[PDB]
Amino acid sequence: MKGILGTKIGMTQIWKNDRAIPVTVVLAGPCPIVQRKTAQTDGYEAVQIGYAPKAERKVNKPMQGHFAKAGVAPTRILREFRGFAPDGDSVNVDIFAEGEKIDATGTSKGKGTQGVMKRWNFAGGPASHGSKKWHRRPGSIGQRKTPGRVYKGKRMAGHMGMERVTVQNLEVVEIRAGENLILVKGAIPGANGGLVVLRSAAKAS
Amino acid sequence: KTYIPKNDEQNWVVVDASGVPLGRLATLIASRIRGKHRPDFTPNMIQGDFVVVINAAQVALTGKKLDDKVYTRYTGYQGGLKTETAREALSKHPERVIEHAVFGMLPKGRQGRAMHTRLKVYAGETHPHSAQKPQVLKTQPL
């Protein structure tokens, strides 16, 4: 349901009481609302929020049209949120609250093409008792004349990372509104400067 | 020497699946699609009336709509891609119980596939008759 948009910023040490706790400072800048999809307009409920600002000289005509339909001010990023609402815009103020468990979802860093050891763990082989299949290189891929082929999915080398990931249940250590800053314990996905989306715990204990 | 073809036609009949046993209704729908009483009654291409189907949701089975009637569908490389659902379980998508029980009785090659197109099922009643703006000779079962 509820949720906001933001830029990851870095992690750092912070003591809450006498326990040093690592956190990820996320800037959940205010988020405008640029379109309310209704189960009677677009067939399903949801809100269109926006994020970084974009210079107007860079805005497509078609987009202006959109953004103007709600006198907003071109953002550069728009995203939806099912079953969400209110009036005006969306800022963490009153949205999230210190202590709330949340789910941060960003785009994982990108590892490019990675072998099986690093993409699936595997194990490759030896390093001395004979070879050319030193450490990496997968083993065998199938079996034989039966299923005389390979399974759809057999883990293999392939572009690793650069995916959508969602780390669940994160305590919100501290919220400094009026800076739209927010500290979540643990570690959120992707690179600093990267987009991140925080929300109510999709399904927490 | 034997007769050629037409086109300028496309009878738009409308069956009703209410209470009728899926099979019988099937055969019929299947038949009028491939070529019922048939125009030039010719193979090469289909002249088989387009068929609209209402209700569906209330077709009929006999001793099993729980037992036996298990529609199977085996996904990607069969790494446990064995999916089975109760026909009653087709309270999710009745429109398929028919759809995919009639495509069965239609030819299986190029044209045949071109043939499921004319078949057009709806699990409702009135609301269906909306997705219907041409003729509609409601030629019920028997």
Binding site: - | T2, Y3, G35, K36, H37, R38, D40, F41, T42, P43
Partner: protein, 59 residues
Amino acid sequence: LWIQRINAGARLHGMNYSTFINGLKRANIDLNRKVLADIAAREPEAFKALVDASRNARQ
């Protein structure tokens, strides 16, 4: 191809190849079979004739 059409007309009245055919048969009189389909495809006026002709030699 012939037998297929001959009864998609046969059944167009209330007969069906099986029956229909034995009928014209019941009337040695009738004896086309060859072109019968065509008659049933082009001349409905005619085809009916032969149709009813059989029922009228049937029951």
